[PDB]
Design a protein around this ligand. Structure first.
Ligand SMILES: O=c1ccn([C@@H]2O[C@H](COP(=O)(O)NP(=O)(O)OP(=O)(O)O)[C@@H](O)[C@H]2O)c(=O)[nH]1
Ligand SMILES: [Mg+2]
Ligand SMILES: [Mg+2]
Length: 1575
RNA sequence: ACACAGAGACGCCCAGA
RNA sequence: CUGGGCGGUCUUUGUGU
């Protein structure tokens, strides 16, 4: 409104008060844009501003009708003028008028507004206009303007006696205002409206006049030029497209675009679906005849009980019907030996011969111990002296023995799989193999598992506090905490050590040691009848090991003396052992590579589980309490899930989320958890699965009996009656939500056997059989009862029109013209090198079609970067130059080549499709187009990540403004069933071509046509076993169908005789058409929004219901939010019934668009909505922190030793942002320290105590020392902050200063201790197939501009390709799966073998000795110059470091937990602010004349002079840079100038609202522990 | 023991017996 | 049926935040 009243709200303090930006988004309902008639002449542009439509929102009232005219010299600034016309009309005032005159070159420039407040306080206001829909453009414009006007203003501040001043920047976009001023929402909405009108005017003027727009850079000009030339000269040969792919006639698209939607058909179908939905609701929820809620809930309970009994009977009928079983859940002994020193004690008082009379295992162990006593000890335990001799200045030694076992013993061992392939044809082996396939009865007695869960001794103190392993961990933790020695640190460390002395953790320690030994032994081989004997390092446990190979089972048997078992884990979930005379033995059990990662990570996992679940129960870390039943149940369930590690066990717990979401369903609807009974069917094979299924069904019946009570408490809504799904114990909502993710403790990366492959094929074939016979309802005509894969043309056009109307409301008319230019830009600028990646591409082709001539060959997937390099070799520069050849090859092939595999995920079974290079090239442009359209949609979240959050909290503001206080919010959280396989791609092509100009249409219709003939290669090993079995005897009809199709006994459409592939016409693939499907679902949600708004307007008896409707949607995942304000009690129930019917009708309206509603959808919940596993329970956002906590050890292979701590810091930050307190984050980091030291050889190397006690003297993260975070702010700051803190307090800074002096004479140094996995063999082969020159570095030294320019010729493209392959991203990308076992297998030789490389290879002990030798010449401290070179944010680090020194003690109080949990952002390390622009653009613009900045020559020279000061070796000549700097290569200099521009570190925190050093202190004092205030 | 409403794995490659 | 060879081995990881 007024210029002055906006400044009046601004508060000024002391000198230059700046503040922080605050984003405003479009929340209010806009009126229609006024009609604008534009005319141009040489005297200017005249616009006839029309009549603004008058709504009740008052928005846009400043827009008045007129014939205003702007001259043809500021015609490029209407967006800057009309947006701010009415807020800057106060003449012009330069800096020198109202500031002291300092004779620099900045005198003459003028800001937008300089208000004087008429009393002696100067406030300066700057305006900015951006056309970027993304929030990044707003931030870029804001930072550019504030950097342009910060330094001169700050200079003029210090020349005044009392400079009470304020600087503000206001940036306006299409759907966002970035301003640091207290500006109200109405003014922001007015700014968006003015921007929209100005942008429409400017686009209308530009579309008929070339010279209005300023001259764009010629790179952009050539980009749109080449894109337009391609799209206007691209002939897809539509005749061949129609003749090749089914249902690819362009007449379909012509009729879809030209024929308007049938209105009468739409209304009739809508009314029919309304009637059907009402009937379904009344039938399923017992609404008629009228009954109160008690009888309805009782009928629901009886129905749930009947359906549960039906499922149980059906499962029991297909099982072995055995009600009693002896099968342990934990296949490891419950032994808890007291850990001792390193020695072999096999002294049997009764002799080894007494072991011989105790069965096959007794005979085996007697012969093993006899061979050990009468043989060399070398091999049972690793030799310390040999490794000391090797380390002070590869081959693997294991003690192997060959027992002469009897035939009965060999038969018994073969029954367990030990050499079981030889004994396959024996009768007992055949009977065991037959019986192993049978399933378990649901009525099997599993009360022992419940007894273990309720009553266990897992959390009892083992009293092993002062044993060698925990002393080692204590020494390492103490040395890590010596740099942060506070009382609070001591309390949290004591809590960690108390958790370490627990029984379950002590058990898991030796279990992890055994798993590490097995992972090491997986690379060995043994002959027939030969075994390996090993002894665990810290425990008196002996292991007999039978290896087969690395990709198959590893067998092990355990043995201990009966006097060495100090205690045991109580419970009957453990497998039965063998009781010899004085020895306890274990039967042979098997493991794989994928099964070892849970056993290795078991101790840290259980420590994290204990800490997390004791925090969620409310007991502080510094308090000691006896465990309760809930803590024991949660910890024991985590224990059993970790040790079980099976997919079905995970799935049963995972489905409890959707089972328990039904308890939030509100009247008149009833909770319906029995809908999840379909997904609970399937074979049961373990007792834990049976127990979990029975508990799940009990929870289902209990929830169907009674919903969660909704309790209004003051102005906030809570829920009562929540409980754990498995335990059944009552708990709060947070613990119930977190307990849905206990199944995530199962290994995501589970290996897929051949047996399990065909079922994944079943997921693809079973949808192709449902293909419609006729294509009439595949895009041609209209149907009211669509079948599978079918949809209505009129409804599709109506949804497209609804989304087009909403897009025109948001971005204004002529939006398609702007979309055209942006699409042309994105297509033209991007080059073929940008598609090069280390991600697999398919090699399936015509040569692989017949199994007859490929039965001996072996198939592998190559990498996309190799094909990109092959294209670059042929002089291919731009992607759009290769689209034509790719499409021609695709059309000549006549199909689309795909190869399949199985995804490793925590949600069940899903397949993954990999395309070849040509299909990738053709699909990329379509996906770019669809992304550009989706970025225009105001409720599509895949392309707009902010919309994931903002719509939900802004719905409350919409409701408050439109209805007033006291509005009821009803939500539906929807899921789509079979999203990718359900969508016939003609629909997607029509939807995409609706939002494009016709010039792109012929491409889009062609490129999507190839999806209607997909040839997907199956695994060749699967066909090798399928070929030899002509007849199938399975009970799954798909197995007979595939066999008969392959052998030719049955004719099917998807498979032919003797082929390596399946054929698919319907559906799309996983995420290949992600953005196009998101656009389709956006159209559908816009149609639903308009339909619901019209239904609310018409009412149920002729008066409108006051309501606000919001929709949010992603790929297939969506939610609907409706707020209504009733005017009475009867009106309330009628309006709620009406809204419930509206939300229920979505399931029936979805098939008209080809979308099928999944049963996981939760409909009609009040004050509750879940969108992306982000649970909003009224004003309380709930995040499942356990989900991120269970993945805090999922590391990647890092060649550098200091990158492991970076990965740990990333995982710790992910845990912190998930909703964990700082003390929990510190305990998780303690577990991470234990994991890191275990992976270095703590339990596998004898030379660790020497390594530990001699690494104490040199705490270097490069050499393996773990830096621990500050407990009051754990996880907030990165690894570099801890490195900088260690440089300023520990003697590491002295070492770094000495190394810097050494490199000066004649972070960066932390990565100088490296290990090469497989000595870069395959990586080297990757360079031996391209023909890339080795002169690349010298050639780019000759031409540094290649590093800062897009492209000039194929030689430069080869140069940047060679730079790309010689990057850490390519290097750290060939690592395969199962990172933890492969990494820990190197922990047996890492310390004392020559494998480490230093910036000749040496050992870690050798490197530490050399560092200690050089540690006597260390002098002084680290220099301020390198204190800014190595740590650009170090000063910023300082303002955090001094802000944590006032929180040092464990003082505080337990306050009442005020629950208003929201998500907030904290900027702890901001952008480095001395230089206005980045150095990457600053150097490039001067050196090569590239307009990468927005500064004039004077400002550019000023920033150049500022860049001079810090580095001091910088030179204007690149040759002088080459011969005047430490960086010998331009590659290193480019990385240096990229990294010296430091990043801004921000943390997303979950907790009480933050009112913006104050924020950091507030979250430290609050988020240390829930319900506790620090100091 | 692993996988599985029985599709696999429980070693693979050679040289001579 | 005797002496041997076997790891970044292959399986294995796609499209978007
Ligand atoms: O890993 C992934 C997960 C999801 N997606 C994309 O997200 C879509 C839905 O992913 P989804 O997890 O919802 N599974 P869906 O196919 O809907 O069947 P259902 O289990 O019954 O719900 C899929 O169809 C893909 O398009 C991927 O592309 N990759
Ligand atoms: Mg959902
Ligand atoms: Mg889905």
């Amino acid at each position: 409104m007024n210029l002055e009243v906006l400044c009046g709200r601004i508060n000024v303090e002391n000198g230059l008060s700046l503040g922080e930006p605050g984003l405003y988004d479009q929340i209010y309902d806009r009126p229609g844009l006024p009609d604008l008639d534009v005319t141009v002449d040489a005297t200017g542009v005249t616009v006839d501003i029309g009549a603004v439509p008058d709504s009740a929102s008052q928005l846009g009232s400043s827009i008045n009708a007129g014939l205003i005219t702007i001259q043809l010299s500021e015609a490029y600034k209407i967006n800057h003028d009309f947006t701010f016309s009415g807020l800057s009309k106060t003449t012009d005032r330069r800096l020198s008028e109202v500031f002291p005159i300092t004779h620099d070159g900045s005198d003459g420039m003028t800001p937008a507004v300089i208000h004087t407040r008429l009393d002696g306080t100067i406030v300066v206001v700057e305006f900015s206009t951006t056309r970027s829909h993304n929030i990044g453009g707003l931030e870029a414009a804001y930072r550019t303007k504030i950097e342009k006007y910060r330094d001169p203003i700050s200079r003029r501040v210090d020349i005044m006696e009392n400079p009470r001043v304020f600087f503000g920047v206001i940036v306006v976009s299409s759907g966002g205002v970035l301003s640091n001023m207290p500006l109200t929402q109405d003014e922001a909405e007015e700014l968006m409206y003015r921007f929209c009108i100005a942008n429409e005017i400017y686009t209308k003027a530009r579309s008929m006049d070339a010279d209005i727009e300023l001259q764009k850079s010629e790179e952009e000009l050539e980009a749109i030029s080449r894109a337009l030339s391609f799209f206007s000269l691209f002939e897809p040969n539509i005749e061949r497209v129609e003749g090749t792919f089914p249902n690819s006639e362009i007449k379909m698209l012509e009729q879809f675009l030209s024929t308007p939607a049938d209105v009468d058909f739409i209304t009739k179908t809508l009314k029919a679906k309304e009637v059907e939905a009402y009937a379904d609701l009344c039938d399923s929820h017992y609404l008629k005849p009228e009954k109160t809620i008690q009888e309805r809930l009782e009928i629901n309970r009886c129905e749930a009980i009947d359906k549960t009994q039906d499922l149980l009977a059906g499962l029991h009928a297909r099982s072995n019907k055995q009600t009693s079983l002896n099968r342990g859940t934990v296949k490891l002994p419950p032994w808890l030996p007291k850990p001792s020193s390193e020695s072999i004690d096999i002294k049997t008082d009764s002799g080894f011969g007494s072991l011989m009379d105790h069965g096959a295992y007794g005979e085996l162990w007697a012969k093993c111990l006899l061979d050990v006593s009468l043989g060399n000890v070398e091999g049972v335990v690793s030799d310390p002296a040999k490794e000391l001799d090797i380390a002070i200045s590869a081959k693997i030694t294991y003690r192997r023995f060959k027992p002469a076992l009897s035939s009965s013993a060999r038969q018994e061992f073969s029954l367990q799989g030990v050499e079981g392939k030889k004994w396959k044809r024996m009768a007992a082996n055949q009977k065991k193999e037959k019986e192993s396939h049978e399933t378990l009865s649901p009525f099997l007695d599993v009360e022992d598992i419940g007894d273990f869960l309720t009553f266990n001794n897992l959390l009892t103190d083992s009293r092993y506090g002062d044993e060698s392993i925990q002393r080692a961990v204590s020494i390492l933790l103490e040395k890590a905490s010596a740099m942060q020695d506070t009382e609070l640190t001591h309390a949290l460390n004591d809590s960690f050590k108390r958790n370490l002395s627990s029984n379950v953790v002590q058990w898991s320690l030796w279990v992890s040691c055994l798993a590490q030994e097995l992972a090491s032994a997986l690379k060995q081989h043994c002959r027939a009848g030969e075994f390996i004997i090993k002894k665990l390092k810290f425990w008196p446990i002996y292991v007999i090991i039978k290896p087969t190979k690395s990709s198959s089972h590893i067998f092990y048997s355990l043995g201990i003396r009966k006097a060495d078992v100090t205690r045991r884990l109580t419970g009957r979930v453990f497998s039965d052992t063998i009781d010899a005379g004085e020895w306890e033995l274990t039967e042979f059990k098997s493991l794989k590579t994928c099964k070892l990662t849970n056993l290795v990570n078991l101790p840290c996992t259980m420590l994290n589980s204990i800490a997390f679940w004791r925090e969620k129960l409310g007991v502080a870390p510094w308090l000691v309490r006896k465990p309760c039943s809930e803590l024991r149940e949660q910890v024991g369930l985590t224990f059993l899930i970790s040790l079980e590690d099976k997919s079905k066990t995970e799935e049963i717990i995972t489905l409890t989320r959707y089972t328990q979401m039904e308890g939030f369903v509100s009247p008149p609807m009833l909770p319906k958890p029995q809908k999840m009974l379909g997904k609970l069917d399937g074979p049961l094979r373990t007792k834990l699965q049976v127990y979990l299924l029975r508990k799940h069904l009990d929870c289902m019946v209990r929830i169907a009996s009674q919903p969660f009570s909704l309790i209004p408490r003051e102005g906030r809504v809570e829920w009562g009656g929540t409980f754990h799904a498995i335990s059944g114990r009552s708990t709060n909502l947070e613990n119930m939500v977190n307990s849905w993710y206990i199944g995530y403790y199962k290994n995501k990366e589970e290996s897929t056997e051949l047996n399990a492959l065909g079922e994944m094929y079943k997921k693809i074939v079973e949808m192709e059989e449902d293909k419609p016979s006729s294509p009439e309802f595949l895009g041609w005509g209209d149907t009211d009862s669509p079948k599978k894969h079918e949809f209505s043309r009129s409804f599709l056009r109506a949804a497209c029109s609804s989304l087009e109307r909403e897009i025109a409301q948001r971005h204004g008319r002529q939006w398609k013209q702007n979309l055209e230019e942006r699409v042309l830009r994105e297509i033209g600028t991007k080059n073929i090198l940008d598609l090069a990646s280390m991600k697999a591409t398919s090699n399936f082709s015509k040569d692989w079609e017949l199994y007859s001539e490929v039965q001996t060959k072996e198939y592998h997937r190559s990498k996309l970067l190799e094909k990109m390099a092959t294209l670059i070799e042929k002089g291919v520069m731009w992607y759009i130059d290769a689209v034509g050849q790719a499409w021609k090859a695709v059309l000549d092939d006549g199909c689309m080549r795909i190869c399949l595999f199985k995804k490793n995920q925590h949600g069940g079974l899903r397949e993954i499709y990999v395309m070849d290079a040509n299909a990738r090239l053709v699909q990329f442009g379509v996906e770019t187009m669809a992304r550009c359209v989706c970025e225009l949609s105001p409720h599509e979240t895949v392309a707009n990540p902010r919309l994931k959050n903002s719509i939900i909290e802004n719905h409350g503001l919409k409701s408050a403004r439109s209805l007033g206080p006291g509005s009821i919010n009803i939500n539906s959280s929807n899921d789509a069933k079979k999203w990718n396989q359900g969508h016939y791609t003609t629909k997607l092509a029509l939807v995409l071509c609706w939002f494009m100009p016709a010039k792109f249409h012929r491409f889009i219709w062609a490129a999507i046509s190839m999806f209607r003939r997909k040839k997907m290669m199956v695994d060749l090993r699967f066909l090798a076993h399928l070929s030899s079995k002509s007849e199938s005897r399975s009970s799954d009809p798909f197995r007979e169908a595939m066999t008969d199709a392959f052998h030719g006994n049955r004719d099917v459409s998807w498979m032919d005789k003797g082929r390596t592939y399946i054929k698919t016409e319907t559906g799309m693939m996983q995420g290949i058409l992600h953005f196009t499907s998101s656009l389709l679902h956006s159209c559908v949600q816009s149609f639903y929004k308009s339909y619901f708004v019209s239904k609310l307007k018409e009412g149920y008896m002729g008066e409108s219901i006051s309501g606000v409707v919001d929709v949010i949607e992603g790929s297939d995942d969506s939610a609907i939010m409706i707020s209504i304000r009733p005017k009475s009690d009867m009106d309330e129930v009628r309006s709620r019934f009406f809204v419930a019917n509206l939300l229920h009708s979505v399931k029936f309206l979805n098939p008209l668009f080809g979308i099928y509603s999944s049963e996981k959808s939760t409909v009609n919940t009040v004050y509750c909505v879940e969108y992306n596993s982000e649970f909003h329970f009224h004003r309380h956002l709930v995040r499942p922190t356990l989900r991120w906590i269970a993945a805090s050890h999922q590391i990647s292979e890092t060649e550098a030793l200091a990158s492991r701590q970076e990965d740990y810091s990333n995982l710790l930050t992910q845990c912190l942002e998930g909703g964990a307190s700082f003390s929990l984050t510190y305990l998780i980091q303690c577990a991470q320290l234990l994991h890191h030291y275990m992976l270095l050889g703590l339990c596998l190397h004898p030379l660790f105590g020497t390594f530990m006690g001699m690494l104490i003297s040199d705490p270097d993260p490069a050499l393996g020392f773990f830096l621990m975070d500050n407990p009051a702010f754990a996880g907030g700051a990165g690894f570099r902050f801890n490195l900088w803190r260690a440089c300023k307090t520990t003697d590491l800074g002295r070492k770094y200063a000495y190394y810097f002096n050494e490199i000066q004479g004649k972070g960066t140094l932390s990565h100088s201790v490296m290990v090469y996995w497989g000595d870069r063999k395959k990586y080297q082969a990757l360079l031996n197939r391209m023909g890339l020159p080795e002169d690349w570095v010298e050639q780019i030294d000759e031409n540094p501009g290649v590093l800062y320019r897009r492209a000039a010729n194929k030689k430069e493209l080869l140069l940047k390709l060679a730079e790309k392959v010689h990057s850490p991203g390519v290097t750290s990308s060939l690592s395969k799966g199962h990172v933890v076992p492969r990494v820990v297998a190197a922990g047996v030789y890492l310390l004392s073998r020559h494998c480490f490389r230093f910036s000749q290879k040496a050992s870690l002990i050798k490197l530490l000795m050399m560092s200690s030798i050089s540690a006597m010449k260390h002098g002084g401290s680290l220099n301020p110059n390198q204190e800014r070179m190595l740590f650009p944010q170090a000063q910023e680090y300082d303002r955090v470091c001094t802000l944590l020194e006032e929180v040092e003690h464990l003082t505080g109080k337990f306050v009442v937990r005020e629950r208003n949990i929201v998500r907030s952002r904290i900027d702890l390390f901001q952008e480095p602010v001395d230089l206005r622009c980045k150095a990457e653009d600053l150097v490039s613009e001067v050196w090569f004349g590239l307009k990468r900045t927005k500064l004039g020559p004077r400002l550019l020279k000023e920033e150049w002079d500022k860049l001079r000061a810090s580095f001091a070796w910088l030179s204007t000549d690149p040759s002088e840079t080459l011969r005047d700097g430490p960086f010998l290569s331009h590659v290193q200099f480019r990385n240096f100038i990229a990294h010296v521009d430091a990043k801004s570190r921000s943390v997303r925190l979950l907790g009480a609202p933050v009112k913006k050093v104050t924020t950091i202190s507030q979250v430290v004092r609050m988020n240390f522990f829930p319900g506790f205030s620090l100091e």
